[PDB]
Symmetry: C3
């Protein structure tokens, strides 16, 4: 691909939307290779992550935890303008697991407060991939402070099953999973700090126990439940992209399955099928395709149930439609 | 299928056997779709999990930990009669990962002590699946108190390898692995309680450490050893179903291998081959097929060896037959 | 084959080399089946695992942690002469996950100090496999004290991808990952012991937390960095064999990918492709094949980033060559 050919490719700016929702995109590529442009402003800010007012000084791409899902197609280029406002206190950068070279982009995007940078990379491999901050010397701290997200590089011709049959989803959601390590005082109460740096020592100590105090979806316990449950209808095909930048997770749709699951998150690797519970290793993203068949409220969780129900890794799906008694029926209701 | 068509299907009452054994069944479907009937009584009882007399208040389906393995074929209907004796003190239900709708059946099977219920679901996906109690707000507690098992939904035409060659086993064993979280007093001694509800607060604190005090097969340290070691003979084909409803595991047959391993536990996903150690995520069941080629004692373990030899995750296999010197021989026995 | 036929086979004595290097071998087997001979002397020795000077009484095959990588081809016989010098104090043996029978050879190789033994086994299955000490009663202690390594059984026709295309690497490295559990005093300082036995009780207590104090490559924090960093060049094809005999790991090449990854380590199981982060469960070895495309420094880590950067699981690659601006380019360097 000559130098002229690359400079001639069309440039297209895209407006990002906050997770679990995903920005406008087409499953099958529209036109030839493009340079897809995105801009994200980094925000350091205190967020409350549970019903007890527990705080964390989050480091958030685009102001959200997880950062937004960026979608492009194989062989498109992703051109990110990353802005670090002077109001922030730390140097930040970004590592796209989808990219090749300079530590995923980290070595070329180190920006101090008051600086911005523009990185471009060719998305040569199809699949969902994690992206995260990675300042040399404090990589895990930045990541476990919520500075991570994922992108999806769709095959130019959309998704397909193991047999080559097309798999077109009606809706897509991005569930970013986050392990937080919040310090506690001797009485067991979560501590609060004035500035991000103040919590550093105490936090690394908790991190070393390899035991998170919270494991959440969309940045807080219950963020994807109640009135914020994701939605679908019977017959609707849904793609659920799930990521975990630092620690293993095992997604499970309670009352459902993963009809096709690219557990490694890479589309050239044939998807597993009829999954009850899939596995995504820390530092990766995966994707599950399911066609809902029963209406009702479903729970979507990390299937180490303590992490799901004691630590916060549980989301909900509200599904409309008609019940199918062939698939399931209460022959005899609960009775003495 | 219409309600009328289902009602016209033949019914077959199966009698369950305690793990690791599996009730009589046929690998290849004997005739068209039928309604396979099972009955299980919930028993809240005390179990001793180690040689130090450590106790756990178990919540056991059919009186055992794990609950028994139920076997049907794809597209059969599994009709479960679940009974919660008045002697029990808690509400219980059942979520079948193999089922579709109402949280796996959990939403339609909540039964208080003194009640019973009958659930019927269609086994549309082939493979081994976990089933476990899941009372709202009490989910992980019940599961880690031993209330879980698995079922196997065989393909109508039995098992096959990745190329369609049939795989027929001579024996089948079901190993249910359980992570227990037993509270300790200020002297490191495990605590005992006179009531299930009495140990709740103490147990949740331990559960939050995400560090089990015990990891066992069939409910206790050494359960599947000695009088309970599994058996086989050189030349015999054996399928080992293994589940873990709450935490990851990595099975390994010491001295052998997993010739064919459906690691995700789903039969429409080709099995991995020539496996040394496979992986099953918390919340799932998997299955390995192996043809013994050497006689002698074998150990079967969760290969985090601390979990296997310090925490209790180890079982034994006694194999009869002639030793094969081509495969292995001691050229020079241990000597000066 | 009969004893006579085995005795007639040619024999080749191989000289082992220290990890991450691998002894000379041919990817495509040259000639028919051979009895490949190896010799390893077990050394119980004190090793320093971090910059602070933390000590561990290692139990090391060939004097290194991990033990060296032995390479044979499918259906060759691996004949190991194992020596336990009289200067040692413990009985040792070896379990080859690649072998069939007697606990992987463990039951035939128990040698006391001052003894030796010669074990021979047929390498019937292709792939990388863990080997580790396993004296009944102290199995995990030996392994987490560093007594483990791996072997590679190459297909006689060399490596191929999932579709029959040959995969020939230019160089190979073996990364053995070790989880250590070092006791600490009341000041949180690592403790030193005069003899290995002295540390047993304290170490077992740490092991039970299932939380290693160190997670390292090639025996120590930073062991594969600086002048010991691995090397490659743009266009070079590298195979990275990775093992972990006791605990899970999720390898990731920062700045690159795993073009083909036999995550399970078994060559007859098609490899995953375009991987960002793969997963190797405790008790197994895996291998990733990658063709470098960008020059510069890369980090190779266990992608639970706390384990990589706080606990020690990080290695570096120095790659020579021309930068590819098509794959990645800084449109705008960090600036105001
Ligand atoms: Cu940052
Ligand atoms: Cu990363
Ligand atoms: Cu229950
Ligand atoms: Cu479940
Ligand atoms: Cu040893
Ligand atoms: Cu082993």
């Amino acid at each position: 691909a000559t130098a002229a050919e690359i400079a001639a490719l069309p440039r297209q700016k895209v407006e990002l939307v906050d997770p679990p929702f995903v920005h406008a995109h087409s499953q099958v590529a529209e036109g030839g290779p493009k340079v897809v442009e995105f801009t994200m402003v980094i925000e350091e800010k205190k967020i409350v992550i549970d019903d007890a007012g527990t705080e964390v000084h989050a480091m958030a791409f685009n102001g959200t935890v997880p950062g937004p899902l960026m979608v492009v197609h194989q062989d498109d280029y992703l051109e990110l303008t990353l802005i670090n406002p002077e109001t922030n206190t730390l140097m930040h950068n970004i590592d796209f697991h989808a990219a090749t070279g300079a530590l995923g982009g980290g070595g070329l995007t180190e920006i101090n407060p008051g600086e911005k940078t523009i990185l471009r990379f060719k998305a040569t491999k199809p699949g969902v991939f994690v992206y995260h901050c990675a300042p040399p010397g404090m990589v895990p701290w930045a990541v476990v402070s919520g500075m991570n997200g994922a992108i999806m590089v769709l095959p130019r011709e959309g998704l397909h099953d193991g047999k080559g049959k097309a798999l077109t989803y009606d809706k897509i959601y991005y569930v970013g999973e986050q392990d937080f390590y919040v310090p506690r005082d001797e009485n067991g109460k979560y501590k609060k700090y004035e500035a991000p740096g103040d919590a550093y020592e105490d936090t690394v100590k908790v991190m070393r126990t390899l035991t998170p105090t919270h494991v959440v979806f969309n940045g807080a316990v219950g963020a994807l439940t109640g009135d914020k449950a994701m939605t679908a209808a019977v017959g609707e095909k849904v793609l659920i992209v799930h990521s975990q930048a630092n620690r293993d997770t095992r997604p499970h749709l309670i009352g459902g399955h993963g009809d096709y699951v690219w557990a490694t998150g890479k589309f050239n690797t044939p998807p597993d099928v009829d999954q009850e519970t899939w596995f995504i290793p820390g530092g990766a993203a995966g994707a599950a395709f399911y066609t809902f068949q029963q209406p009702g409220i479903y729970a979507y969780v990390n299937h180490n149930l303590i992490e799901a129900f004691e630590l916060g890794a549980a989301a909900h799906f509200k599904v409309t439609g008609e019940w199918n008694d062939d698939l399931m029926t209460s022959v005899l209701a609960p009775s003495g």
